[PDB]
Design an enzyme around this catalytic site. Structure first.
Site, mmCIF file in Angstrom:
data_model
loop_
_atom_site.group_PDB
_atom_site.id
_atom_site.type_symbol
_atom_site.label_atom_id
_atom_site.label_comp_id
_atom_site.label_asym_id
_atom_site.label_seq_id
_atom_site.Cartn_x
_atom_site.Cartn_y
_atom_site.Cartn_z
ATOM 1 N N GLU C 251 0.847 -0.952 0.086
ATOM 2 C CA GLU C 251 -0.020 -0.020 -0.021
ATOM 3 C C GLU C 251 1.013 1.304 -0.019
ATOM 4 O O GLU C 251 1.709 1.531 0.996
ATOM 5 C CB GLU C 251 -0.840 -0.001 1.187
ATOM 6 C CG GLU C 251 -1.989 -0.982 1.302
ATOM 7 C CD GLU C 251 -2.991 -0.923 0.232
ATOM 8 O OE1 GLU C 251 -3.564 -2.337 -0.182
ATOM 9 O OE2 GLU C 251 -3.146 0.194 -0.355
ATOM 10 N N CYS C 286 -2.477 9.061 1.806
ATOM 11 C CA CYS C 286 -1.941 8.464 0.650
ATOM 12 C C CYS C 286 -3.316 8.352 -0.646
ATOM 13 O O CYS C 286 -3.115 8.343 -1.613
ATOM 14 C CB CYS C 286 -1.769 6.775 0.559
ATOM 15 S SG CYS C 286 -0.349 6.611 1.626
ATOM 16 N N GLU C 380 3.936 12.920 -5.093
ATOM 17 C CA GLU C 380 3.270 12.788 -3.943
ATOM 18 C C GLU C 380 3.897 14.151 -2.960
ATOM 19 O O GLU C 380 4.900 14.095 -2.367
ATOM 20 C CB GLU C 380 3.343 11.620 -3.379
ATOM 21 C CG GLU C 380 2.293 11.607 -1.968
ATOM 22 C CD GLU C 380 2.334 10.271 -1.133
ATOM 23 O OE1 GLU C 380 3.303 9.545 -1.139
ATOM 24 O OE2 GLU C 380 1.306 9.729 -1.032
#
Lengths: 480, 481, 481, 481
Positions: C251, C286, C380
């Site tokens: 993940e 996330c 990100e």
């Protein structure tokens, strides 16, 4: 002094000037409760409220349905002993069995709470051939609508739970007609449900009804499903006169058991056979009525089983050590007594019991009862076991099938092929391997073939009957 | 001219003998095209006894054997495609294009069944859900219900037979089929095909057109475990009431509505889809689009285009390749439709086009603002008649779609995400068609209705469910040495 | 301000001894709030040996026993709710409102797991698919994979631990958990809960904060059958490469876009959901909405309302009830975000609001037209930064949403049925959020991504799949006497 | 005499040109029977680029189009049956009876895939599991993973290619297949079949025999989303380690045991199945029965009957109809087996029969009481060698079956209900064969192993799962007007 009870009309407790129904303590025969009897106008109002509550019931969030069921579980745990005591009082079942029933009712409502958040749909491709190009479907399940519930007296709480819990889990309003001999358990569920805010107004009604009005539960066109647990002749007649509605039937049985080995040992085998043969005093649709033992084990099983029968305590069901309580009525006990005398007269060999004391029938074992006798042909619903010997296993399976009933069967075997041969050839809804036929897990598919009924109970299976399939067929959806 | 003599199927074998004949007419010319033996009471009794006697061998077949039977049917249908289509047009009166479409869909039905026959999955279930249930597990498996009584219709003489026969073979259920007396040839062709398949046990099937005096055996006989009927609602509901202990599956009529709230993808395609729905097998369909609800802003454009397209539909000889609309099943059926059109008009309906009768032919008809009082609006028309209505509120249109005692299928044309899923949630039907008319059916989809439209679902895997019985093997401490 | 001394869990038991202490700081004040023992290499070796030794007892537990464990966790989490929520804000710096939301979601995760633990269904499969396979059937059952290695993050110290621990207990897998060294207290609270549960076998769990020199054991150790990691992409991909024979679940990060093509149901609710996604846990998520694509017709209205709502967001002490935005995990994390904002602006980005740093705090930031060249657009950001863009073509907006090496989740606001399903079909992600921002996650949904966002899915029943191995019992003529 | 020149498949097209020739030998005579063009580095690069470019068209195919491709393969395999079976015996050395059995199983594999291609079901999930999640629902749908790298073995040159190719087409995944260099003709025959199928997009497939210098592209190339390998364990595990970000599926070796605790149904059938298992493809099978554990009470009777039956096995020309045992893949393979037999007998093993080599031929061998120290007991022999052992305790026999670093399949002969389910529960394998040897595989069953035997499952529907990615459409208040 009898306790005065309320009934439930469109989610509300009602009493008024309604005729009183006496509920007796099945051990002492004293009137322990006064219960209002619903009028024709009450049944009509209850059904109208169920129809009117159906959209709100269908608009509930899955978590709201779960909330209702989880609140029932909490309340049943809270009032455990009070409920178990009431259950023994109105049904006559030993306090140990009544506690076992409340425990199983908590399990039923808990399985329903978990299932209420798991009603999955399907996404299906529909372009199976060239003509069907650009087609896909969403298959979703919807509540059937208002449900007619007719419950029995042998499990006044659990057999109500197996209808009420799936209905709430799905989002179906319902009208329940409890058995007039044992309505107190259903009314306790009514008291619980009445206090749950999440449940829409008119979602439930719990109504003991007169013989002249009882037919509304069968014929009324406003109900989308009839779900009945009880007598076969009554059930089959209700199915015939139901009209357009779907019908679910949980009826009698004449459950056999094959003993081909001791699994794991003789002591445990005898114990499971005693449990099955005298399960709720035989007042069960899965009571082990017929016992087929292989010739090599016959004398050993007969001796141990009869010796253990002789040790069972029969008496006051409120006593902690009481194994066998009285029958539902003195007429029920008289009926069992007649069938025992008839079985013996037709050539049956009485090994133990067979005597009556008011509503009490002694735990009875009769050897070699012919098919001609009512005790062998029909459901006894009493503490009677019919013992038989066999030499061939395939023949024992054939004899287990030699009945117009077909609910459950039991089989004790260490043989891999015998176990799966029995699973394949026994004409029943459930085959119990290495336990008697009287075993039921509240999540398992439960029901029968032949005269034992139509469809399955067991929370997720009962939910299926309360659901209707709808497909959204989508043509070129996602094409800009 | 000379009628073709057919054989009927008794306990897997072709029979003729000293039996009475049933005339099968060409629905266009009215000539007796076929003569079919009519089964006696003794034949039906023998057929049911053979089905009971074949039930163990049917249940003992390997999944691959049931698959082989179904695959052989598919091969034979493909081989005899045009011959079957021509017979279909002749006995039903449906245009040859529609008859070919039906043979294609029947191939699909038998093919879906062949694939499903090797996919009857069971469940391994944990049963130790609580401490009292310690050491328990279960194996849930499905078993054939047993002998099945099948009663099929005349509007789809082949595909609506396939939707009963293919699931029964896929599961391993012996059956006795009563085909419709007006259209039994399609069912008898399947019988010719099945009769030659070695894998299928003796007595597994019987296809018997029966007289009115013996027809009741299919309803009441205790040897049948399931009754599966497709046809008239009043007949179906009466069969359900008198069936006895057996399970009942019913596929009955409908009064299918359609909402037009947008043109998806455009007007031309919408009109084209509304025409297919409104004149699906000349309206002789349980999912024929009988009622059309168009939004006020689109109304005049839809009315104009739809009526203009209705006026272009070719009505005539169903054997002609360009015929869109064939005759009705009988002159009495056409007379009945004609009466309901006249009645709708008398009660305030405005006739936009058609409404005239020519023997068994009914002109494609559109009637505007027909009240609920009229039979054309209240009941299933089962003819080439479309009732046009205007709406201003979408929620009200959905409510009006639901304003019927039927609940088979509904259609909705919308570009709106919320309107589409509101319709899926609130339409009281078995199937909501999104951006197509309600006349759409995929042979693998769950097909059936709510209310007077019937009980349960057809569509191969769903029909197989009704022909199966659940059995659980509850196992106590299995694997403990 | 005395730091609280914590215990770690070795083979189900609380351990302390003479182990090196790790400081855990209050992320708002920077004071050492907790002292935690750091496990040695011998501790990790002992923990893994105990997990191997506990695997048979874990696999022998009744489904109801695994249920009881999970139900006891739920009861304890409910009991210690505020204590846990306060510990969470303290070690993570997330506002107390968000910390309470995390404890609620953790109760949901453990509750879903309790219900799933009694629902591990198997299959009964026919295996006689062809003649050669005559007399064959199978029982397909799922078994625990064995000892699991868990490596959890700092952004959701409790819920992202629950999403690994709850499925492992539901299945009956022993585990060794390496919590994040910056936030281990949430995992140690689960540890003290589990330590008191009698049903759970000895050695079933270990929770060990470890040194950098030993952290590699969680990746390479051959005794573990599965590695499940949530965290940084470069670390994750390197762990997958060096994992050896074991299965790997990852993940990782995201660069979540959102399309605004309509206001659903209205502008006020749309702005509210866009603010929620864009400033979700201060962007330290996330699934944080990093990129916002608004249709040209709606652009000026959305920009004005969104920027005005950003300006109203309360940034400060996370223990305050009205605080919306807390500090970043470290001052270096905030400095990193500050650099990328300055870089985005230097490369042509137009700063609409925010962009300033105050220690570990970053102002909620909105930057318009940031090019792909800038790190803020390419990578990100894991901070309270939203990149605003305008579009004229919907298909192009979907293509731009896909223009990233990440692929976790995407959002879409539309009233159009076809746009919604076009986005579901063409968005290269694990989850498409319809009429909400990409920051939405239900703890029972399949959660994970494509591309650099990871491999496999979390969400209780999906994570349980990765912790299970398929076994078939192929049975030849079983039931033949 | 003259070797047949074959074409390779580059972006769906047959290519030859000026490419280097790879010799394919007749494994019985050792003559060069075929010459195949070896793909260059540029060819492999072009093939992968074409697979990436064909991925959208593959994903846009209708389910019926993917079905049609697979059904056309089945038709062509049936048509060229004997030609394919003869080519298989020639390049692999397996007896013609076994080669025909392989072509039959390949037809089954492609047929199971055709049926599964129209059955990729999704889920409709309620997401309002708690109050915070009110108004949420989800649609879970599966999507093709993208371009697949396939590396197939030489022991089943056709079926083990089918088990990768058929699921990929059923899902809609483009692929690049590297067939084994010793046996590529079976793969190239499929390529010819596939090349003529119009429904399959251009660039959907490439079947490239590749040199050792270029073979690594199938492992490391980032354009592939999945690597599926069947072959040698040390090679496979090394490929998994160096694969990068892609998902990996591995079908590796085994050291399959069998327990004989009873004769089921009798001694003759038990010996027959044991013989089939011990000498399955001359032991050149990942599920070959290498270890035989017989109960002490049955030992002497089983040993005598099994050794007598071994002595009757015909070894010779694989083109002969009555040949049971053909040669090994190479003389070096046979020499390796010969060494391990000599080593087993030197370490205390008692040779009962065989053990001698004649070029590439190894006599069917039975060795009694071989210790764990010997390579024949510890490792996959992959030859016609069976190790016989006696046991007194059943639980100990199961423990000894598990005493290996492999874990693909196991066999058990028993009449005992509890022993059968104890073996299913405790055998550390992917498949337990009940009342047959471990050498049994149905092409629809989940096939694969634990430990060093690999990761994940093959068997059409299970292999399809690995070629699919989960996507959820999370819908907020959809259907609210």
């Amino acid at each position: 002094t009898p306790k005065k009870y309320n009934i439930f009309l469109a989610s509300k407790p009602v009493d008024g000037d309604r005729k009183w129904l006496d509920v007796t303590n099945k051990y002492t025969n004293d009137v322990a409760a006064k219960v209002p009897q619903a009028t024709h106008k009450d049944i009509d109002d209850a059904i109208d409220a169920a129809v009117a509550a159906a959209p709100a019931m269908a608009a509930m969030g899955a978590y709201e349905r779960k909330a209702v069921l989880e609140k029932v579980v909490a309340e049943l745990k809270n009032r455990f002993e009070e409920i178990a005591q009431t259950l023994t009082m109105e049904s006559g079942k030993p306090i140990k069995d009544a506690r076992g029933e409340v425990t199983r009712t908590i399990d039923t409502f808990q399985v329903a709470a978990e299932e209420s958040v798991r009603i999955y749909g399907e996404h299906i491709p529909l372009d199976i051939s060239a003509r069907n190009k650009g087609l896909q479907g969403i298959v979703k399940k919807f509540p059937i609508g208002p449900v007619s519930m007719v419950s029995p007296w042998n499990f006044p709480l659990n057999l109500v739970a197996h209808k009420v819990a799936p209905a709430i889990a799905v989002g179906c309003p319902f009208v329940l007609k409890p058995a007039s001999r044992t309505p107190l358990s259903a009314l306790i569920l009514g008291e619980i449900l009445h206090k749950i805010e999440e449940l829409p107004l008119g979602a439930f009604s719990i109504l003991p009804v007169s013989r002249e009005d009882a037919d509304m539960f069968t014929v009324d066109e406003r109900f989308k499903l009839l779900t009945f647990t009880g007598s076969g002749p009554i059930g089959w007649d209700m199915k015939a006169r139901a009209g357009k509605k779907k019908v679910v039937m949980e009826l009698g049985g004449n459950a056999p058991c094959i003993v081909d080995d001791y699994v794991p040992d003789l002591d445990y085998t005898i114990q499971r056979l005693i449990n099955g043969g005298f399960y709720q005093g035989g007042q069960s649709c899965i009571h082990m009525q017929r016992l087929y033992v292989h010739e090599r084990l016959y004398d050993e099983v007969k001796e141990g089983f009869v010796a253990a029968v002789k040790k069972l305590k029969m008496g006051n069901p409120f006593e902690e050590d009481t194994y066998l309580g009285p029958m539902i009525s003195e007429s029920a006990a008289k009926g069992i007594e007649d069938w025992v005398k008839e079985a013996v007269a037709k050539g049956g060999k009485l090994l133990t019991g067979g005597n009556r004391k008011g509503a009490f029938i002694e735990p009875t074992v009769i050897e070699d009862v012919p098919i001609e006798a009512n005790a062998r042909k029909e459901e006894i619903f009493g503490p009677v076991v019919l013992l038989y010997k066999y030499s061939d296993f395939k023949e024992a399976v054939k004899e287990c099938n030699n009945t117009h009933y077909g609910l459950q069967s039991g089989i004790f075997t260490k043989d891999l092929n015998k176990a799966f041969y029995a699973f394949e050839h026994m004409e029943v809804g459930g085959v119990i391997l290495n336990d008697s036929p009287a075993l039921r897990v509240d999540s398992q598919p439960y029901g029968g073939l032949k005269d034992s009924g139509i469809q399955r109970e067991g929370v997720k299976y009962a939910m299926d009957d309360m659901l209707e399939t709808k497909v959204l067929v989508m043509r070129n959806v996602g094409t800009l």
